[model samples]
Target: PLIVPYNLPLPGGVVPRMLITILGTVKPNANRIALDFQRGNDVAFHFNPRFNENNRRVIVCNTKLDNNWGREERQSVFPFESGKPFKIQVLVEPDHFKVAVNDAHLLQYNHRVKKLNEISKLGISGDIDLTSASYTMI
Candidate 1:
């Protein structure tokens, strides 16, 4: 569930072989879109566009932990533009990401980041008005 108040682009860049996990939901009325490491452009593995661009954004979790002894990460994508305000919640574990949107929907995705646990750093690039951004380790 993504709550946006303006227009922005959320661009993501990952290594060719690095693995990562995406998790989140779109507003009830808004449409959901995303992009992975599967596109090619003028630059060779330098820059690639995502799936959606308009009034929504994306939320993701990395699996690269410090101990590297957990399960795989999970990735999820959704569309929510119908409602004015929407939100999504997800948990990024050592190897997977558990997504809970509006407390009604759930999803998962496999780990994509290499040595994720030790990475511990997330790169957020895009153009969108984020009302709030937060994450906690449980």
Candidate 2:
């Protein structure tokens, strides 16, 4: 929330029974945005929203191992609106992660980087005004 490309240390690392929250507003002219859970430069979870990837808006999620990206999992339902605020939550589970936007459940991503505790950092970047980013135990 401090600024784009902001990096923060996860208080207790990412583990099951925790919810990571991000509060932000989409810029009117925003084309894309990124949210990542990382261990150093390695990303265990990569969440992206592209306003238009050529033809339509898509919510893309993936993982990066040593900067080598894995297959992308994209969602066509675009719940985010330009010039609007959103509360996003990423719920860590023993086997996967559940995502919700504006308090409504949105999607789920299967574990790609199974060592959940290894992800200790959260990074925010791209075209959006981040109001806050933190986590709470559930």
Candidate 3:
């Protein structure tokens, strides 16, 4: 599948307990994939999965402001596979975001941008074929 960047507006913004779901398949030679929740030029949450970086499996979480990346939080428990479909869910919280992959708990990232409601966009990019993406408040 061809990899193309996808961006969508998060209508009504993201509130506490809102759930964001992304469905996609990692490309065979994928190097990385990034799911970013943003407000204008600032990224509130960045969920990045690296497949071949340094020849290791890692998921890096971070934020971006003024086009600068913040300190990264890396996880080694890789749950995604090349040429396989994946389900990624992010639960919005007051102070953090809880992530899950394929119905399994992944990790939590503390809020960096502070205002969740200000996150009005969801952007996805990198080496993956996205099939579906949606959000629901709960």
Candidate 4:
């Protein structure tokens, strides 16, 4: 079954040097996938991979504040494949979040909404099947 939007609570919230990992498979007809670290209505990080939006290939990273979307950081190199499984790791740092996909370094998103402890929730959504999601402090 497909888990459209999976939400998990980060116990004690995220601290510096903590890691978040997600394992999932892309649907054969996947059009997009998204993972978000959220605090209430604000999104600390919005990691979105769009396969067919605008018929362009890119990964869009952004943050939401005051119910508004920030400027997006678009990445061209996509490491996900349709019908294939993938692993994503996100490391929280003092100033940014380091991310990797399929064991390959993907990109980093700077801290727009600092106060790491406020990021108490993680949300996953889109055209994919999620197998597992976890977090650890390092």
Best by TM-score: 4
- Residue 98 in model 4: shift from native, Å? 0.7
TM-scores across all candidates?
Answer: 0.39, 0.94, 0.94, 0.95
Error of 4 at 18 (Å): 0.9
Sort all candidates by lDDT, best to worst.
4, 3, 2, 1
In candidate 3 the C-alpha lDDT for residue 39 amounts to 83
Report the lDDT tens digits of candidate 3 across residue range 1-138: 324698878875788988999888888888899999998899989999999778899999999999999999999999999899999999998889999999999999999897777899999998889888888878
Give per-residue CA lDDT, model 2, range 1-138, as digits (tens): 467778878854688989888898989988998889887788888999999899799999999998899999999987899899988899999999999999888899998887787788989888889899888889
Cα lDDT of candidate 3 equals 0.90
Q: Give the per-residue lDDT of model 4 (tens digit) for 55-92.
A: 87689999999999999998998998889999999999
The deviation in Å at residue 135 for candidate 3 is: 0.8
For candidate 2, the per-residue lDDT at 54 reads 92
Cα deviation at 122, candidate 2, in Å, is 0.6
Model 4 misplaced regions, further than 4 Å = none
Is 1 or 3 the stronger prediction by TM-score? 3
Which regions of candidate 1 fall more than 4 Å away from where they truly are? Answer: 1-79, 118-128
lDDT of all predictions: 0.35, 0.88, 0.90, 0.90
